[PDB]
Design a protein around this ligand. Sequence first.
Ligand SMILES: [Mg+2]
Ligand SMILES: [Mg+2]
Ligand SMILES: [Mg+2]
Ligand SMILES: [Mg+2]
Ligand SMILES: [Mg+2]
Ligand SMILES: [Mg+2]
Ligand SMILES: [Mg+2]
Ligand SMILES: [Mg+2]
Ligand SMILES: [Mg+2]
Ligand SMILES: [Mg+2]
Ligand SMILES: [Mg+2]
Ligand SMILES: [Mg+2]
Ligand SMILES: [Mg+2]
Ligand SMILES: [Mg+2]
Ligand SMILES: [Mg+2]
Ligand SMILES: [Mg+2]
Ligand SMILES: [Mg+2]
Ligand SMILES: [Mg+2]
Ligand SMILES: [Mg+2]
Ligand SMILES: [Mg+2]
Ligand SMILES: [Mg+2]
Ligand SMILES: [Mg+2]
Ligand SMILES: [Mg+2]
Ligand SMILES: [Mg+2]
Ligand SMILES: [Mg+2]
Ligand SMILES: [Mg+2]
Ligand SMILES: [Mg+2]
Ligand SMILES: [Mg+2]
Ligand SMILES: [Mg+2]
Ligand SMILES: [Mg+2]
Ligand SMILES: [Mg+2]
Ligand SMILES: [Mg+2]
Ligand SMILES: [Mg+2]
Ligand SMILES: [Mg+2]
Ligand SMILES: [Mg+2]
Ligand SMILES: [Mg+2]
Ligand SMILES: [Mg+2]
Ligand SMILES: [Mg+2]
Ligand SMILES: [Mg+2]
Ligand SMILES: [Mg+2]
Ligand SMILES: [Mg+2]
Ligand SMILES: [Mg+2]
Ligand SMILES: [Mg+2]
Ligand SMILES: [Mg+2]
Ligand SMILES: [Mg+2]
Ligand SMILES: [Mg+2]
Ligand SMILES: [Mg+2]
Ligand SMILES: [Mg+2]
Ligand SMILES: [Mg+2]
Ligand SMILES: [Mg+2]
Ligand SMILES: [Mg+2]
Ligand SMILES: [Mg+2]
Ligand SMILES: [Mg+2]
Ligand SMILES: [Mg+2]
Ligand SMILES: [Mg+2]
Ligand SMILES: [Mg+2]
Ligand SMILES: [Mg+2]
Ligand SMILES: [Mg+2]
Ligand SMILES: [Mg+2]
Ligand SMILES: [Mg+2]
Ligand SMILES: [Mg+2]
Ligand SMILES: [Mg+2]
Ligand SMILES: [Mg+2]
Ligand SMILES: [Mg+2]
Ligand SMILES: [Mg+2]
Ligand SMILES: [Mg+2]
Ligand SMILES: [Mg+2]
Ligand SMILES: [Mg+2]
Ligand SMILES: [Mg+2]
Ligand SMILES: [Mg+2]
Ligand SMILES: [Mg+2]
Ligand SMILES: [Mg+2]
Ligand SMILES: [Mg+2]
Ligand SMILES: [Mg+2]
Ligand SMILES: [Mg+2]
Ligand SMILES: [Mg+2]
Ligand SMILES: [Mg+2]
Ligand SMILES: [Mg+2]
Ligand SMILES: [Mg+2]
Ligand SMILES: [Mg+2]
Ligand SMILES: [Mg+2]
Ligand SMILES: [Mg+2]
Ligand SMILES: [Mg+2]
Ligand SMILES: [Mg+2]
Ligand SMILES: [Mg+2]
Ligand SMILES: [Mg+2]
Ligand SMILES: [Mg+2]
Ligand SMILES: [Mg+2]
Ligand SMILES: [Mg+2]
Ligand SMILES: [Mg+2]
Ligand SMILES: [Mg+2]
Ligand SMILES: [Mg+2]
Ligand SMILES: [Mg+2]
Ligand SMILES: [Mg+2]
Ligand SMILES: [Mg+2]
Ligand SMILES: [Mg+2]
Ligand SMILES: [Mg+2]
Ligand SMILES: [Mg+2]
Ligand SMILES: [Mg+2]
Ligand SMILES: [Mg+2]
Ligand SMILES: [Mg+2]
Ligand SMILES: [Mg+2]
Ligand SMILES: [Mg+2]
Ligand SMILES: [Mg+2]
Ligand SMILES: [Mg+2]
Ligand SMILES: [Mg+2]
Ligand SMILES: [Mg+2]
Ligand SMILES: [Mg+2]
Ligand SMILES: [Mg+2]
Ligand SMILES: [Mg+2]
Ligand SMILES: [Mg+2]
Ligand SMILES: [Mg+2]
Ligand SMILES: [Mg+2]
Ligand SMILES: [Mg+2]
Ligand SMILES: [Mg+2]
Ligand SMILES: [Mg+2]
Ligand SMILES: [Mg+2]
Ligand SMILES: [Mg+2]
Ligand SMILES: [Mg+2]
Ligand SMILES: [Mg+2]
Ligand SMILES: [Mg+2]
Ligand SMILES: [Mg+2]
Ligand SMILES: [Mg+2]
Ligand SMILES: [Mg+2]
Ligand SMILES: [Mg+2]
Ligand SMILES: [Mg+2]
Ligand SMILES: [Mg+2]
Ligand SMILES: [Mg+2]
Ligand SMILES: [Mg+2]
Ligand SMILES: [Mg+2]
Ligand SMILES: [Mg+2]
Ligand SMILES: [Mg+2]
Ligand SMILES: [Mg+2]
Ligand SMILES: [Mg+2]
Ligand SMILES: [Mg+2]
Ligand SMILES: [Mg+2]
Length: 68
Amino acid sequence: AKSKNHTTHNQSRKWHRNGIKKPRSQRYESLKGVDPKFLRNMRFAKKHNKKGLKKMQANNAKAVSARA
RNA sequence: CGGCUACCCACCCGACCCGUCUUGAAACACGGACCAAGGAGUCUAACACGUGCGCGAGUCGGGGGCUCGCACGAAAGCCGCCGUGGCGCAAUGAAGGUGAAGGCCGGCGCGCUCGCCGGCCGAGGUGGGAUCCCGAGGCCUCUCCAGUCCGCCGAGGGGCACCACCGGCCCGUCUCGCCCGCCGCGCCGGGGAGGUGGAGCACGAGCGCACGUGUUAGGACCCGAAAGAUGGUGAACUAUGCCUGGGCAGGGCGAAGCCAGAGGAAACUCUGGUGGAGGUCCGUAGCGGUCCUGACGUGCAAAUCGGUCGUCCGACCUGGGUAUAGGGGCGAAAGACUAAUCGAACCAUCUAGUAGCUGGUUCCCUCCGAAGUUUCCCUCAGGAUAGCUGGCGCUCUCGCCCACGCAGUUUUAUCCGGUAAAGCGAAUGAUUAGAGGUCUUGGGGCCGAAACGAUCUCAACCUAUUCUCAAACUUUAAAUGGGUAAGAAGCCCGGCUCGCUGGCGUGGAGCCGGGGUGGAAUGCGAGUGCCUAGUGGGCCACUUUUGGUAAGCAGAACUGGCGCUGCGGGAUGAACCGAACGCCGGGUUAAGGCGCCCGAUGCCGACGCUCAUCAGACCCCAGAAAAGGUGUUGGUUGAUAUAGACAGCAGGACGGUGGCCAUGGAAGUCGGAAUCCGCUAAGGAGUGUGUAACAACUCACCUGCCGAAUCAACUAGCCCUGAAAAUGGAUGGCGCUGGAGCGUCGGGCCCAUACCCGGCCGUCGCCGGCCUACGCCGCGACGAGUAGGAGGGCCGCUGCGGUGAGCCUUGAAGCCUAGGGCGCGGGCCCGGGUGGAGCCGCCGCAGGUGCAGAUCUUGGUGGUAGUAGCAAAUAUUCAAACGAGAACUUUGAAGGCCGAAGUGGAGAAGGGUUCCAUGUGAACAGCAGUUGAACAUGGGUCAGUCGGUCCUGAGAGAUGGGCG
RNA sequence: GUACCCAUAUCCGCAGCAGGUCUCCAAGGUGAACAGCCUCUGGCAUGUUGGAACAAUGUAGGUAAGGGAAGUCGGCAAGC
RNA sequence: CUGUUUAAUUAAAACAAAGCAUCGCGAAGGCCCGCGGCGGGUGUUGACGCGAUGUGAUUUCUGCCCAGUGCUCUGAAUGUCAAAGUGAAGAAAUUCAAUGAAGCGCGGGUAAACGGCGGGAGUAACUAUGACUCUCUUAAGGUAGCCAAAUGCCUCGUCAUCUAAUUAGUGACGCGCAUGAAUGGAUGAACGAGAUUCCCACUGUCCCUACCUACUAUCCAGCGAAACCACAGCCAAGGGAACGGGCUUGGCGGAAUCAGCGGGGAAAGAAGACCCUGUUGAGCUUGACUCUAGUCUGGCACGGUGAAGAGACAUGAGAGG
RNA sequence: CUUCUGACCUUUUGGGUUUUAAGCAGGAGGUGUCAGAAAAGUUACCACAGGGAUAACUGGCUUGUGGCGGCCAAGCGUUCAUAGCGACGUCGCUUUUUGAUCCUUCGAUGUCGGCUCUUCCUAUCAUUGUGAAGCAGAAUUCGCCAAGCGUUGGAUUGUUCACCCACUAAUAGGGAACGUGAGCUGGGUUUAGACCGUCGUGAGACAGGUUAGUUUUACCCUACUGAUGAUGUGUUGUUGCCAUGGUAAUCCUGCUCAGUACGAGAGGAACCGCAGGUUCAGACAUUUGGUGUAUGUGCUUGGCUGAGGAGCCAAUGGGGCGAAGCUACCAUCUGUGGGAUUAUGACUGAACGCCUCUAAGUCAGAAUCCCGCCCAGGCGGAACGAUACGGCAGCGCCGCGG
Ligand SMILES: [Mg+2]
Ligand SMILES: [Mg+2]
Ligand SMILES: [Mg+2]
Ligand SMILES: [Mg+2]
Ligand SMILES: [Mg+2]
Ligand SMILES: [Mg+2]
Ligand SMILES: [Mg+2]
Ligand SMILES: [Mg+2]
Ligand SMILES: [Mg+2]
Ligand SMILES: [Mg+2]
Ligand SMILES: [Mg+2]
Ligand SMILES: [Mg+2]
Ligand SMILES: [Mg+2]
Ligand SMILES: [Mg+2]
Ligand SMILES: [Mg+2]
Ligand SMILES: [Mg+2]
Ligand SMILES: [Mg+2]
Ligand SMILES: [Mg+2]
Ligand SMILES: [Mg+2]
Ligand SMILES: [Mg+2]
Ligand SMILES: [Mg+2]
Ligand SMILES: [Mg+2]
Ligand SMILES: [Mg+2]
Ligand SMILES: [Mg+2]
Ligand SMILES: [Mg+2]
Ligand SMILES: [Mg+2]
Ligand SMILES: [Mg+2]
Ligand SMILES: [Mg+2]
Ligand SMILES: [Mg+2]
Ligand SMILES: [Mg+2]
Ligand SMILES: [Mg+2]
Ligand SMILES: [Mg+2]
Ligand SMILES: [Mg+2]
Ligand SMILES: [Mg+2]
Ligand SMILES: [Mg+2]
Ligand SMILES: [Mg+2]
Ligand SMILES: [Mg+2]
Ligand SMILES: [Mg+2]
Ligand SMILES: [Mg+2]
Ligand SMILES: [Mg+2]
Ligand SMILES: [Mg+2]
Ligand SMILES: [Mg+2]
Ligand SMILES: [Mg+2]
Ligand SMILES: [Mg+2]
Ligand SMILES: [Mg+2]
Ligand SMILES: [Mg+2]
Ligand SMILES: [Mg+2]
Ligand SMILES: [Mg+2]
Ligand SMILES: [Mg+2]
Ligand SMILES: [Mg+2]
Ligand SMILES: [Mg+2]
Ligand SMILES: [Mg+2]
Ligand SMILES: [Mg+2]
Ligand SMILES: [Mg+2]
Ligand SMILES: [Mg+2]
Ligand SMILES: [Mg+2]
Ligand SMILES: [Mg+2]
Ligand SMILES: [Mg+2]
Ligand SMILES: [Mg+2]
Ligand SMILES: [Mg+2]
Ligand SMILES: [Mg+2]
Ligand SMILES: [Mg+2]
Ligand SMILES: [Mg+2]
Ligand SMILES: [Mg+2]
Ligand SMILES: [Mg+2]
Ligand SMILES: [Mg+2]
Ligand SMILES: [Mg+2]
Ligand SMILES: [Mg+2]
Ligand SMILES: [Mg+2]
Ligand SMILES: [Mg+2]
Ligand SMILES: [Mg+2]
Ligand SMILES: [Mg+2]
Ligand SMILES: [Mg+2]
Ligand SMILES: [Mg+2]
Ligand SMILES: [Mg+2]
Ligand SMILES: [Mg+2]
Ligand SMILES: [Mg+2]
Ligand SMILES: [Mg+2]
Ligand SMILES: [Mg+2]
Ligand SMILES: [Mg+2]
Ligand SMILES: [Mg+2]
Ligand SMILES: [Mg+2]
Ligand SMILES: [Mg+2]
Ligand SMILES: [Mg+2]
Ligand SMILES: [Mg+2]
Ligand SMILES: [Mg+2]
Ligand SMILES: [Mg+2]
Ligand SMILES: [Mg+2]
Ligand SMILES: [Mg+2]
Ligand SMILES: [Mg+2]
Ligand SMILES: [Mg+2]
Ligand SMILES: [Mg+2]
Ligand SMILES: [Mg+2]
Ligand SMILES: [Mg+2]
Ligand SMILES: [Mg+2]
Ligand SMILES: [Mg+2]
Ligand SMILES: [Mg+2]
Ligand SMILES: [Mg+2]
Ligand SMILES: [Mg+2]
Ligand SMILES: [Mg+2]
Ligand SMILES: [Mg+2]
Ligand SMILES: [Mg+2]
Ligand SMILES: [Mg+2]
Ligand SMILES: [Mg+2]
Ligand SMILES: [Mg+2]
Ligand SMILES: [Mg+2]
Ligand SMILES: [Mg+2]
Ligand SMILES: [Mg+2]
Ligand SMILES: [Mg+2]
Ligand SMILES: [Mg+2]
Ligand SMILES: [Mg+2]
Ligand SMILES: [Mg+2]
Ligand SMILES: [Mg+2]
Ligand SMILES: [Mg+2]
Ligand SMILES: [Mg+2]
Ligand SMILES: [Mg+2]
Ligand SMILES: [Mg+2]
Ligand SMILES: [Mg+2]
Ligand SMILES: [Mg+2]
Ligand SMILES: [Mg+2]
Ligand SMILES: [Mg+2]
Ligand SMILES: [Mg+2]
Ligand SMILES: [Mg+2]
Ligand SMILES: [Mg+2]
Ligand SMILES: [Mg+2]
Ligand SMILES: [Mg+2]
Ligand SMILES: [Mg+2]
Ligand SMILES: [Mg+2]
Ligand SMILES: [Mg+2]
Ligand SMILES: [Mg+2]
Ligand SMILES: [Mg+2]
Ligand SMILES: [Mg+2]
Ligand SMILES: [Mg+2]
Ligand SMILES: [Mg+2]
Ligand SMILES: [Mg+2]
Ligand SMILES: [Mg+2]
């Protein structure tokens, strides 16, 4: 009882009925697969930022506000 | 007079018989003779999602108890120190076990890749984010003054839910090291910084009840097996033993034994009788069944009958009793018989056994609407997964010089590739021929004792060319096609963090802060979550292609179509050409067509081709080739002709030379090579016929007459030959020839459910109004559809709780009806006629709720059809009586059959009143009946000496005892 | 217990079914004979119906001139 | 040979038969029944008997192979080998070791047990074929017989007879795909409701059909079904699920009927006995898988007393390398 | 599941130690049907649910193969390509062979061959009319229009096929579901019994061979054959036409021609005419033969009526003859012509000064076509006769008014 083996007929119609839209592009996609050393350095820079940010950046903001 | 309709008839057009398996159904595929009733997705437990309700970090009394005995009460009410308990509120490890709060500010110890302290609120930050808040600005009678009065908005802020990311916390692990504590200073505990695994935490949402869908276990939508197990019943048929009885006409052959006679010296032999044996022969009764493959073959018969057969003293046939009973018995063995069933009986139960397999599966309308494909499976007639589909939503966006976002598309930049084509005087592999050079090699000829001492040639090698090819070759290389980008998620500027890297404040990432959106065209509203049926056999077509000679063959790529689909043309039709579908009126048209079927050329239509004794007449499509035509109609390349051709008529057609090679003959004429010469006006060492050769005819050539065009080869349009198949017959038919054929066209005309305008119905979107708000309006765009998914029903059936101060013996339900009428529809209302005691509307509730099929179950009725059939065994007739009725009864007579192995007289088994008498004649008797073995009534079986009872036979059987 | 059928009509086979079912008695003629045929004692209406005709086909039965198996797979049937 | 056989498609060459052979058994036995018992059949039996097989009148013949598969017999010389029993290590569970019943393995016998019986090369004064000989193989290479057979593919083999003509029949030939010796081979009087060939007489089997008789069939009187039925029935061509009756184009088309007929209705009788699928069954067989009755051995109790003897363990002592 | 490796790890259940076991992580022991069950064969004694998703029939698509043709022309043909063949190449038709695919058929289409019978096809074996030869005659070979008429009797085989004998003008090829099984036959294939050979340990298998092996139903519709009828002409009858459909004739022998034409001989025709015969068709019974139940007559076996005489019975007792009727190629009679034309041969005659059967026009022309003869006569019509007593009637024609 030989039958049909494999065809791709009437497949593009099934695909285009729902759509072949591109994947959802969003900001801050992901951080997976990134170098572990680079990720560790980024975490350290993010967690040590508020130590010196809230003072020197505030002083510079006051200075630029006095400038303009 | 008006009247649609469930009345009948006629014409015009269209019209194949329904249901399901299938790519394909009206099929010469299956089911259906018809009608009435019954008939198929239910219920329980569990799970998932969605919706309604109540409570809410809680929720739930379903389990019990309490009040008072109760028709409604197997209800309802309550427990409150009955919440035991289930679910959720805490997760992570196999386990010992552990087990979730961040942020700001300042200080100190080296504010150290650095802990602690003190104060506060208290679940971080970034980019989006409905909504809300603030808000420059301008919008209302003459004016500076105002609170309401008119009234939107640039920009900015805190930001629900939700989305993405970063960080934070908990549990199990791996690396690194250091610190703290002691009910006891230890292979005792606790803590940190980094990478990972968790169904986690990071202000919680679950619980209980009901409904709908989907999956699953229950017989589980309905009907259906071959089979398996348990426990019992059959030897009245048949197979076999045993016991006890019965039966087998007549003839033929002539075994042993016996007697007599004859022959012989003896042994002995021979002859004629008698004798009556045989698993003997012909043959009857009996027992079986060879052939006619005879008759029947819905029969006499679920195995028979007529001839013809084999055996008939036996291994014979047969009655009764008795023993063996189902994986068993019995078997002169055919797996035959075992109660019409035997390669494993019957009966009841498990059992509604299972089926990936057939068949069926019941009311209407509206909306949406496929797949035969990927992967896996002992998978290929199936299932799971993905995909296609539907439903429920949810989050936002427009609606009062500018949008977020998207696209089977184009435009601009940008790469990617190795097909089509082309090439091999370019790589690789195949490949024909020529030209030159030869270093060498091999085969021939030459000078000559031989010799790379010399020479000619061939093969081989090299060089520059040359002809033809590669899906598994390629320098080069298309079209088509694939990806990306065309902004605010971007750019410029400044400053902080890094434990990453490092000459360097170097590089790179992260964060913060203020300033500047108009960035290719066109079109469009987008995003997202959950549940989910069906599908998982396909087919066809333009083009590209694999195997095959080819196929209406098998297998692929894109797109379209059928299946899932009607309509107008192709006469006919699955795929072709147009075109897609609510009900209508008008106009137009696509494809196609205008001689009649059949609507339209019935145009004073145009140009040209074509004649068939087989014309021709429209993609798929239903017919044909190589080749040929002095049949016509066009074209090309050429050659001749007033220095008079081509055709026709007439004349010449000679000499060297009967030339050289041949020979039985070649003297132009069978052959090989050649092939000239001289006078001429021209004659060819000769185009053909003929002779064995010579002769003869004739031709090339020249000339005489006529007199102006002609000859030859190819090429392509119609037509013709090529062209033969079986029932009579297919441009669709009739037919058509100044066309109704072929080619090129013009102006009109014909009609589709297509287009435009308008009415009506429904869906969707936008909405409008403070008029059943679940109602009433307005505008616009769309309506097909199998499998399947949803919504509505004031469609229908049954019963229950309310309600209609409901209808009815002045007529309920039901049934019938050329009557009226409503709704698109399921259906319903009224009138009339039967009928004689119940029924219905509205609001909710629960179903054993809708039939056209299932070789569906039961019951009834048709065509067949007053048909087949009342024919195995020789045969009936006359008169009379009883009777309404005579062929079937009775009596008499005549003619016949069974003819003693009977169609007679008696019995055993079996039947049980069938035996007898009387009486009726609807039923029985296959017609009839006065008749009967039918019906009703009443009678009938008399035993010491007929048999049972008595006795044992094969055999069955209790106690003693044994086993269980 | 004692009737009756004991059967092509009282049994079984779905029935008044050419089927099946165990025994006794059994004459005369022809003839070897209980073969076949014809009669007597004893039974019967021809087997679930009759009338009219004698077409084809059919079911059983018998002949056919000349040939004699030449038909057929086979001398099947029929025939001697 | 007589006889029996598939009731209801077979009557036979099949089965059976006397005869001829072989196997087991001396009763605490052989072959079987049985859930059970020292229960039952043979057995009211005892080797001229019982039980289990093969071949199949009489005569003559019974060839060669034990390699394999089966059957049987032997020695605790000899390998494998379960429970139970013994010793050792360990606190014990446990582990190790010594020995080891049947069976298997080894060896012998048996083929009237199942079965089998090959293949090359050189050699005769016409040549070939071939008297004769060498060689591989395993256990032995078809002996005596018989044949194109009921056994032969080539084949309708070749020759002779039978015929006018023969794929038939008979006789003979014989590297015979693939005959053959109790798998029985060769004959063979009588008898086959056995199959086949020829001949004589015979006849309607036929040339070549015709006629006659009885019962139907036929019409009528009376009585009266069933099978089947989607609706129903005139054809040609085309398309179509590729062979229509209904569709399209044409040919055409008057009621109701009787007697035959068998071309059609792809006629009826039955969910194809043929082929395939089923993760559907049943019968049967075996060196398919897993089990079991039964059967053969070993151990444990029933199961008790005496004597003699062998092997090992522990004990003290004397020889040895 | 087993084994190994590591923690100076976890649990070994009332609490401790130890053996052991379980537990975590990763390496190995395998699913070759490789996303992974543990698995021999036969059933012809077979069964069930299904499949035309899937073979054995036919039909359908193509024709490789088979058969049948055409073109080119190297050559055969003594000479000479094409009288007759024609290689190397190449182009077509057919489904009378086989093969390829599986489209309809699995709730069945009865599947070989033979017998009987009808029709059709032509790629013609013979017959009618013709052309060409290496056609002197005869016998032959190649084509043209041509299917009207024939294409037999047997030996062996189941056979399709094939071979042989004989006859004949010739013994040609096919189709219709490989025509035809509710027509037959069952010889083989293809069930169940059994035998032999080979294969298999076995059950069993063999497109190997040999034997015996149930052949069911029509009464329905149509078609066909025949018979009543129906429609319309007012009724009925007689005499008549045919529109239409069917269609029948075919072949051979002997004699005169003629031992002639022809041919050197050997050999050896043809036209007209005369006798017939084969097959087929229509009938017919005087003669001949069949049948026979006038149960006509006369013998004869057994029994029966007492015996003669007369008879009867024995499923028409047998047999010798036989009227009438039916019947036989087993006897007898008969079977017939006109037209237009095909193939072909010709006339006049241009295209194309000539030629030419053609281009327009003419001629002859046949088993083929049609009709004539014959068969039945239509939802076809004509010509003629009679047309309703009896007592009241009834029915026609003319003229009529309502
Ligand atoms: Mg598939
Ligand atoms: Mg239905
Ligand atoms: Mg199916
Ligand atoms: Mg199909
Ligand atoms: Mg259908
Ligand atoms: Mg059908
Ligand atoms: Mg059918
Ligand atoms: Mg039916
Ligand atoms: Mg109903
Ligand atoms: Mg609690
Ligand atoms: Mg069942
Ligand atoms: Mg089982
Ligand atoms: Mg039992
Ligand atoms: Mg008995
Ligand atoms: Mg005898
Ligand atoms: Mg004899
Ligand atoms: Mg007899
Ligand atoms: Mg019989
Ligand atoms: Mg019998
Ligand atoms: Mg027989
Ligand atoms: Mg018969
Ligand atoms: Mg009959
Ligand atoms: Mg007899
Ligand atoms: Mg005899
Ligand atoms: Mg006898
Ligand atoms: Mg059993
Ligand atoms: Mg039986
Ligand atoms: Mg059983
Ligand atoms: Mg069920
Ligand atoms: Mg599949
Ligand atoms: Mg979706
Ligand atoms: Mg490529
Ligand atoms: Mg290329
Ligand atoms: Mg296919
Ligand atoms: Mg295809
Ligand atoms: Mg479908
Ligand atoms: Mg669609
Ligand atoms: Mg469509
Ligand atoms: Mg159409
Ligand atoms: Mg197009
Ligand atoms: Mg289109
Ligand atoms: Mg319109
Ligand atoms: Mg048009
Ligand atoms: Mg018109
Ligand atoms: Mg043509
Ligand atoms: Mg067409
Ligand atoms: Mg076609
Ligand atoms: Mg031309
Ligand atoms: Mg025509
Ligand atoms: Mg529309
Ligand atoms: Mg719709
Ligand atoms: Mg109601
Ligand atoms: Mg009343
Ligand atoms: Mg009442
Ligand atoms: Mg119901
Ligand atoms: Mg119904
Ligand atoms: Mg039914
Ligand atoms: Mg009733
Ligand atoms: Mg009826
Ligand atoms: Mg009748
Ligand atoms: Mg009868
Ligand atoms: Mg009277
Ligand atoms: Mg009487
Ligand atoms: Mg008498
Ligand atoms: Mg007697
Ligand atoms: Mg008697
Ligand atoms: Mg009475
Ligand atoms: Mg009666
Ligand atoms: Mg009585
Ligand atoms: Mg009574
Ligand atoms: Mg007395
Ligand atoms: Mg007594
Ligand atoms: Mg007892
Ligand atoms: Mg006791
Ligand atoms: Mg009595
Ligand atoms: Mg009887
Ligand atoms: Mg009887
Ligand atoms: Mg006598
Ligand atoms: Mg006498
Ligand atoms: Mg009578
Ligand atoms: Mg009777
Ligand atoms: Mg005769
Ligand atoms: Mg005679
Ligand atoms: Mg004779
Ligand atoms: Mg003879
Ligand atoms: Mg024969
Ligand atoms: Mg006979
Ligand atoms: Mg017997
Ligand atoms: Mg028989
Ligand atoms: Mg014993
Ligand atoms: Mg013997
Ligand atoms: Mg031997
Ligand atoms: Mg041995
Ligand atoms: Mg032990
Ligand atoms: Mg020699
Ligand atoms: Mg030999
Ligand atoms: Mg012999
Ligand atoms: Mg013969
Ligand atoms: Mg052998
Ligand atoms: Mg041999
Ligand atoms: Mg005679
Ligand atoms: Mg037709
Ligand atoms: Mg056909
Ligand atoms: Mg057709
Ligand atoms: Mg039909
Ligand atoms: Mg119609
Ligand atoms: Mg139609
Ligand atoms: Mg009739
Ligand atoms: Mg008939
Ligand atoms: Mg079936
Ligand atoms: Mg499967
Ligand atoms: Mg079975
Ligand atoms: Mg796999
Ligand atoms: Mg099996
Ligand atoms: Mg058998
Ligand atoms: Mg198919
Ligand atoms: Mg087929
Ligand atoms: Mg049938
Ligand atoms: Mg049929
Ligand atoms: Mg003819
Ligand atoms: Mg046929
Ligand atoms: Mg046979
Ligand atoms: Mg057989
Ligand atoms: Mg002469
Ligand atoms: Mg002469
Ligand atoms: Mg005749
Ligand atoms: Mg006569
Ligand atoms: Mg006569
Ligand atoms: Mg007489
Ligand atoms: Mg007499
Ligand atoms: Mg007398
Ligand atoms: Mg008699
Ligand atoms: Mg007579
Ligand atoms: Mg006579
Ligand atoms: Mg005649
Ligand atoms: Mg002519």
